[PDB]
Ligand binder design. Structure first.
Ligand code: FES
Length: 101
């Protein structure tokens, strides 16, 4: 494993695609906000639905999230405030309304 790495993050938002580099040790949401991007959030701690998105391409680490159950992780759900990229990723944002619980 490299000590450090950078990953291309593409966010498909309701109003456009936005893209940015994200370090291996920076959450999706923080890397987006570093580039002026407006995403939904609240707790910023991985324990709610505000920042939910759907993984479309690549792989994510979500050790730091606690709200999504294993079934939801297997459905492609992502808490963008608690997810690190481990590859180039594409994520559809603003998806909280699709969650059941
Ligand atoms: S804002 Fe609450 S889990 Fe991300």
């Amino acid at each position: 494993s490299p000590e450090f790495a950078a990953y291309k993050v593409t966010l498909v938002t309701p109003t456009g695609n936005v893209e940015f580099q994200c370090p291996d040790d920076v959450y999706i949401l923080d890397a987006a906000e570093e580039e002026g991007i407006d995403l939904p959030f609240s707790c910023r701690a991985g324990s709610c639905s505000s920042c939910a998105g759907k993984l479309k391409t690549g792989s994510l680490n979500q050790d730091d999230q606690s709200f999504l159950d294993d079934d939801q992780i297997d459905e492609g759900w992502v808490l963008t405030c608690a997810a690190y990229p481990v590859s180039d990723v594409t994520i559809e944002t603003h998806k909280e309304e699709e969650l059941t619980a």
